[PDB]
Amino acid sequence: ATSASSHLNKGIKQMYMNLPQGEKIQLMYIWVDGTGEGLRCKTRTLDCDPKCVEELPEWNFDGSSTFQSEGSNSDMYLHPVAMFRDPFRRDPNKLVFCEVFKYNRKPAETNLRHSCKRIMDMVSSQHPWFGMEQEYTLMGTDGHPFGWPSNGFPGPQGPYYCGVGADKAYGRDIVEAHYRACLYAGIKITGTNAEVMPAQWEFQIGPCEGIRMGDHLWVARFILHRVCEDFGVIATFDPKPIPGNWNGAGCHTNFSTKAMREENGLRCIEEAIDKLSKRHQYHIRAYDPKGGLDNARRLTGFTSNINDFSAGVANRSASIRIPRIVGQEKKGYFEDRRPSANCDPYAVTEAIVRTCLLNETGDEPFQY
Amino acid sequence: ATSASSHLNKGIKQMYMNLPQGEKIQLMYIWVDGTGEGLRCKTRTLDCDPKCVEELPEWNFDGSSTFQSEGSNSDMYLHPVAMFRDPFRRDPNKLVFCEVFKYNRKPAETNLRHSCKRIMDMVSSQHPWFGMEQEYTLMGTDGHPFGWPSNGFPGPQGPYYCGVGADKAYGRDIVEAHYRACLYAGIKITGTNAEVMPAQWEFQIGPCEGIRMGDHLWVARFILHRVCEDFGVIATFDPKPIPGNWNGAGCHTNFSTKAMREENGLRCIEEAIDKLSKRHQYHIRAYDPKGGLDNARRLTGFTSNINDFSAGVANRSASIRIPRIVGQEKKGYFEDRRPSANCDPYAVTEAIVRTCLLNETGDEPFQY
Amino acid sequence: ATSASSHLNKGIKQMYMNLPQGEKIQLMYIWVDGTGEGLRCKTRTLDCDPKCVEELPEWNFDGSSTFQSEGSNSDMYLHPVAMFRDPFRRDPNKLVFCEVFKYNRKPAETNLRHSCKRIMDMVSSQHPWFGMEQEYTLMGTDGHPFGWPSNGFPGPQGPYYCGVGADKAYGRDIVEAHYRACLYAGIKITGTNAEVMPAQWEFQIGPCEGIRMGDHLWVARFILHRVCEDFGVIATFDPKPIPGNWNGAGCHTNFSTKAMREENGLRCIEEAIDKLSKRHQYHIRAYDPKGGLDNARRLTGFTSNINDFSAGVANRSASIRIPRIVGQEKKGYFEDRRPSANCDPYAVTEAIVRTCLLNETGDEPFQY
Amino acid sequence: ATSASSHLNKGIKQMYMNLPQGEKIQLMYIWVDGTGEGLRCKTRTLDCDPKCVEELPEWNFDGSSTFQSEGSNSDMYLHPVAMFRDPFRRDPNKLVFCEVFKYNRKPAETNLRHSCKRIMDMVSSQHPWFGMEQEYTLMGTDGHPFGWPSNGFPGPQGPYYCGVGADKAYGRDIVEAHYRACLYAGIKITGTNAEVMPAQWEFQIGPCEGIRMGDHLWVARFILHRVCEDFGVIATFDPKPIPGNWNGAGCHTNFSTKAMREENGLRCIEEAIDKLSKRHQYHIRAYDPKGGLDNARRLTGFTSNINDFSAGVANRSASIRIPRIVGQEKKGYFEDRRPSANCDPYAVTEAIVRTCLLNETGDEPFQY
Amino acid sequence: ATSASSHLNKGIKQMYMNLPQGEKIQLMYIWVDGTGEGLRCKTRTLDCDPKCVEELPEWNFDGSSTFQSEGSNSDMYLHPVAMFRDPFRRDPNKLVFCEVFKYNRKPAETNLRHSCKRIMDMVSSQHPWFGMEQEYTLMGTDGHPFGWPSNGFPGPQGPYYCGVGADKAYGRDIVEAHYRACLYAGIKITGTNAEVMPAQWEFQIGPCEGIRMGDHLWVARFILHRVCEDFGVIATFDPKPIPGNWNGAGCHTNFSTKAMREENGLRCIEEAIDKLSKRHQYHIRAYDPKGGLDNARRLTGFTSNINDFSAGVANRSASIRIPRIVGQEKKGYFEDRRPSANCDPYAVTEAIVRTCLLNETGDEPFQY
Ligand SMILES: [Mn+2]
Ligand SMILES: [Mn+2]
Ligand SMILES: [Mn+2]
Ligand SMILES: [Mn+2]
Ligand SMILES: [Mn+2]
Ligand SMILES: [Mn+2]
Ligand SMILES: [Mn+2]
Ligand SMILES: [Mn+2]
Ligand SMILES: [Mn+2]
Ligand SMILES: [Mn+2]
């Protein structure tokens, strides 16, 4: 069951997009709404052919329509912070991820990018590298996963992981289109695979230094949403898209700095793991938009326990996993398997840096 | 009845694949899962534009999701061994067939390529050439062959063999696409034809010296699976896809060495045939993933008998067939008609070489 | 009602065929099965880029699957005799019409091309030119003509002959595609038209000297079959596809030699017509694969009578028709309207030459 | 695929038929058209409430519309000869099988009942008893058997004979309704079963003395036609409804007289069998409306050969079969397995009586 | 996916069955074909209104069409042995379960009722009571269980056992109709329930002394088949209708005699259980038509192991279960959980009596 807009003749759209647009450039403005998990987009025309993000002009939108402000002063300004080519409108047009701001220049409630960027500007001396493996479930318009039998379930799990075939991988066309669009847009995407759950996939955004990780992950999520809209399906980042004995959707996070990637860098990995063991409660609170409510359906064991912390080397069921190659070479990175699929990358990255590099302690972040 | 993902608009996918990806290269990693008949695929991005297979980096995957390992140490490393262009992502992207290894560098349970490669490295002085004619049945998502009437059977056998017409060949588009993809990828494919059973086809991988035969056959199987996934059907290698008076799916194997292709080389053919007559039980055990259980439904006579060995010149019903041209010219090769359609090419090729060139005897292989 | 394979997404097939195949060349081998009216095809890969037909290698196939041989020695060799470009695989790939031979080099039962070629090698001094107007009926997979109402008939005959419009010509796309494919392949096709019966068309293969007529007609029939398979319909050459007051499908034959096309050549036309009047029974026996059984449903008068011979100038209902322009100019050719639509062109052409140029008499052909 | 009239709401028809009609009585007049295998029906209202057939009035119809007469004098009179209750209009209304007569009181071309009744009036002293097992194929409106897969065939023969289950018996509702209607109408029906061919059934009309056999069989055929019309399918009496390896539809005939059912009556069975052996050609000519043309597709062996006569005890493949119980008890009847399913019962019964009781000889019947 | 005959308008069938048939009585003859698991039915008309089974006449049928005899003497006689009212044709018509016999009065290959009846005539002094709980799976015409999602599976097992609701019980209408038909026909049916597998039900035939158990169970199976045919689904008695983690279909058997139901009758239960422990191999061979081949897919543990025998009190996983109430009261019966769902009740009952009451020993039955 696909969307009604998907059944429109795409040949007409291809013919219309084949027109030479000319000097005019369409700038698609992207930002995060008040829910903290959704995205919003609207386009504008610019004729100067800009080169840098700082050249792009500020924009404003009605925040009362995005669950971001009341009716008194509902106007919210958009400050561009990321600059990417548009894969749905080819090279001349561009994708613009923006930072939401209130009417009085204050950061919005869901605008975690301001604090995240401040933290990484503080810690840039250590060069923190992040990589997050977003896992999403391809769902039809009917609320059930794509390709799943009507009013039923497919076979048991096990053949679907990284599977090839009509009965092993559902909606691979969406994944291929999203991969090509992310490569075209300049998103630092490293790879993709099919997860254990059928119609559930994964794409790994590559090492991005600091705020670039959150920027690239958010733009990749928007690109995936637009590709699924073109194909007529819905990509949901719910941690537990289907209750029962089905694999949950999570977003593991890899963390590494200059010392952790240097020779004999395992000691810093142990220090970071101990700090995360100390701040497990804060991290699990900050690893999803609902403060652990959504992640309680994925990290239920039977995925590490939500209420119990555990770490180890090459442990799939541990909250923090050290790659076996990292332990063998005594250097590399460590993977945080706690964050959910709908987690805000800015909050996750900020919490990881605060616990590791800033030695933060307590139950609340410290304002600097 | 095709897959639900097939009904997605392919024009959108074509438009997205028309984007210039640029310097980034997608490497699709392919390996054999724990079932020994299925295949798994997942992709990664590499920016160095590699030339040789040894340059490609090693990868790891969760073996517990592919019926290959337990939960203790479920990580399995991937060692690339074959290097091919990607027909589904054009020239810059590549297909990578990999060798599965355990966490402690030991070969996996289904990783027969290690022993096969060792054997052919031993016997490379004789230059063994192999060619296997894989026969597959095009099945819809409903478990019945493609193009077959709903809840029924088509006309009797005889018009469908190498037939041309709407009512004589089912799913020829898949066969043409697979042939073009195999030619593009560099797979040494020689030809194709429609088998006696409707919707059942065949493609013959050409003479490949040693381990290249298994590599090319496995990559061709993966390419066929991906093409059928694109078209929305399922290609099954079951030896007896439909019970009753319907032709079974098998994978005949041609074998030849330097002496067997030389002048007056028929004597070596007789020696090899006698050795296979001696080791019929071992060969029939090693000619399918289930140790003769699957092949018991195809080689039931009425196809040579599974429990009875027979060989001859230009004999269709014999286990080993000498081509009539080979007998006329007193040189050439001989065909082994016993292996099933789901047989692992590595095991078949290794058994043939062990019986012929290594003069192996007994009921178990000898470890060197 | 079209075939289930037709509903497959052809965009995927176009994308796969857009790949550059490279140096490898696919040779599609074509031959006539044991029924004498059907065709069989299977392809092979050749890397030498051949120029002439004699360079192409011989092939073999299982004759027991084509109603051509018993189980004792079921292998039948294929000897290429015609060389054509492949319209379904573009210029580098080629179509190969082959001559079927038994295991002991003897011509097959349905291999009339050997005797036909011998006869025309004998009579090449007179330069016999032949042209046959094959008429076929476009039928869906349901056994009823294409575009005909479900469980019914269209309007009465008369508007459909050479008609233009949605309600006047059924399946014109197949005819256009077949015409383009025949022109691309080098088939000497002269024209096409819609016959009186709806969904029944006709294409006229042009003057081809001797065995070339049979070769080109058979290759054109195969190309039509493949085009209909691509479009999902079935092209039947039955003489009476639909019983009742509907036009039958026939294949008229034009015959001319050097003297018949020369000045004052009408006398040779009268001599040939008298010889055919003498040998009407032999010709009507040899003008269809069933020895007049199939043609008894078309040549029933109400089309000349099957049991009565008649000839004249510009007579539609006569067995032999002299074109009015030929009579006016006292030179040209004459048309034989007796052969059926499923007639073997080799047998028809051989019988015509034997009666006209070889002055054959009796009820059986004379072996030379 | 059922008829369009079948999809009409039958609840409305039931409601309308629930009305009390009153004193008026509907008389459905039945007769055989010019084809000799079809039936025609039209009704009239009579208010006298008749008791005997001779009371019913004569009727007339346009014979030019039933392939029975030319346009000069196309009126044909109907003479009622059989009297039966109407199962489609309940007890007060009646079914009337009539005898067709020309304008000049001469019997029609297809009116074999006159000669048949004369013969049995001659031979009534011997009390000939006849029973014919009509076998019919339930076909949908699309020309393919009922319940058969679209554009295909069901499983092989063997499970369908007298089968019970959804996949073993097709259209059993029609058979049950026809059995109930025949029992209600007074037709001497003995039993029913499912034949080897799927959707092919059989009903055996019981021992009827003389002309009553033909009358009851024709009325039963009409009742079956009307029941199939109500259900929306077509009951065809073609001897070979589906070409190939499928069971044909035939109408075996049992014959017995007073001496043949008496003690030590086997000698008369041998005499009758010898007479039928003598007159096999006449019988096979007179056992179908087309003079053996239709039966040539059923009695092709592989059913006794059409051109070869054979008889025996408990022989299924013999033209004449003596039941094994009859041979054991030295009395009873013998079965004639030659007549086709579309045979006229009057002609079959008349030929059997002429050969057995009247000792007729030659190639043409003798007019008395 | 239901049968095409199910979509016929049942209002017409109801109207036709509403006719008063009168004095004529339809006798439906039922017997077991050569497969040993299927059933066959065909009807005849009798006008004497019989009271007892011995009054009914013998019948004959073509055994070559039921996989029961060769073509030499294919006639097989039917001897009625059970007498039941017909629920599909109301009170006047009757159901007749018959005993198949060869042409020479010898019992057929699948006619186990003769030996079973002889054994129970021998052992009638002890009054053996049997009750078998047949479990069947309601399957559509497509080969998948009724109500299951197309190309998929429903939720996991556990809510479906004896469930009530649209999503908990599939095809309850068939079960209710079958229960009513069995009660009407006089079948000693005790109860019904829905098994763990969805669309899989169970009906328990009550205590029937000796051969009556087999008779009633076979007639109940035929009634279930006819009811499913009316509703358009297929009732399969396969031991493992769906491979995987789904409950298998079995037919447990309760056994009790006069001593076992008397006071302090537990000792005889122990003796019988010990005898069955001794003869486990013979029983498991004789508990299905395929000699343990079918039951190997159901009794695989994970249902007691097929190769391991075990017995106990109130043990679900044991081959022989003593009911807990029986152990508490020291009297009653014991349940044999080994027989499969397609088991012949005659063979099961005969084996149980031979092991228990006749003290049979060895690997083959002893002919008396
Ligand atoms: Mn992963
Ligand atoms: Mn991972
Ligand atoms: Mn082959
Ligand atoms: Mn072969
Ligand atoms: Mn014309
Ligand atoms: Mn013409
Ligand atoms: Mn019969
Ligand atoms: Mn019979
Ligand atoms: Mn139970
Ligand atoms: Mn129970």
Short mmCIF file of C-alpha atoms in Angstrom, two decimals, chain B residues 84-85 178-191 204-208 212 216, chain C residues 17 19-28 43-50 86 89-94:
data_model
loop_
_atom_site.label_atom_id
_atom_site.label_comp_id
_atom_site.label_asym_id
_atom_site.label_seq_id
_atom_site.Cartn_x
_atom_site.Cartn_y
_atom_site.Cartn_z
CA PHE B 84 34.17 -7.80 -10.75
CA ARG B 85 32.47 -4.75 -12.21
CA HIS B 178 21.15 -11.61 -16.49
CA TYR B 179 23.16 -12.45 -19.62
CA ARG B 180 23.92 -8.77 -20.23
CA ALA B 181 24.82 -8.22 -16.57
CA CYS B 182 27.13 -11.25 -16.53
CA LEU B 183 28.85 -10.10 -19.73
CA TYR B 184 29.25 -6.60 -18.28
CA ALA B 185 30.62 -7.88 -14.96
CA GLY B 186 33.28 -9.98 -16.70
CA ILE B 187 31.72 -13.32 -15.77
CA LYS B 188 32.93 -16.02 -18.18
CA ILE B 189 29.43 -16.93 -19.36
CA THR B 190 29.19 -18.92 -22.60
CA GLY B 191 25.49 -19.25 -23.40
CA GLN B 204 26.63 -22.13 -18.95
CA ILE B 205 29.65 -20.56 -17.26
CA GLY B 206 32.64 -21.09 -19.52
CA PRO B 207 35.98 -22.82 -19.00
CA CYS B 208 37.53 -21.29 -15.88
CA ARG B 212 37.89 -19.18 -11.00
CA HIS B 216 32.45 -16.98 -11.44
CA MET C 17 20.34 -3.84 -22.11
CA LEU C 19 25.03 -1.81 -20.54
CA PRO C 20 28.02 -1.92 -22.92
CA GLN C 21 28.56 -5.64 -23.46
CA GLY C 22 32.06 -5.14 -24.87
CA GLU C 23 34.04 -7.62 -26.95
CA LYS C 24 31.79 -10.61 -26.22
CA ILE C 25 29.19 -11.39 -28.90
CA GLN C 26 25.97 -13.35 -28.33
CA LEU C 27 25.05 -15.70 -31.18
CA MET C 28 21.39 -16.74 -31.14
CA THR C 43 22.34 -18.44 -27.55
CA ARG C 44 26.11 -18.76 -27.17
CA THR C 45 28.98 -16.33 -26.62
CA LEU C 46 31.74 -15.90 -29.21
CA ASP C 47 34.72 -13.57 -28.79
CA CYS C 48 36.31 -13.68 -32.27
CA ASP C 49 33.84 -11.19 -33.83
CA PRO C 50 33.02 -13.34 -36.88
CA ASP C 86 20.21 -9.40 -33.98
CA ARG C 89 20.57 -7.40 -28.97
CA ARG C 90 21.70 -4.66 -31.41
CA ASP C 91 24.52 -4.73 -33.95
CA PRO C 92 27.35 -6.69 -32.22
CA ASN C 93 25.11 -9.69 -31.52
CA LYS C 94 23.77 -11.75 -34.41
#
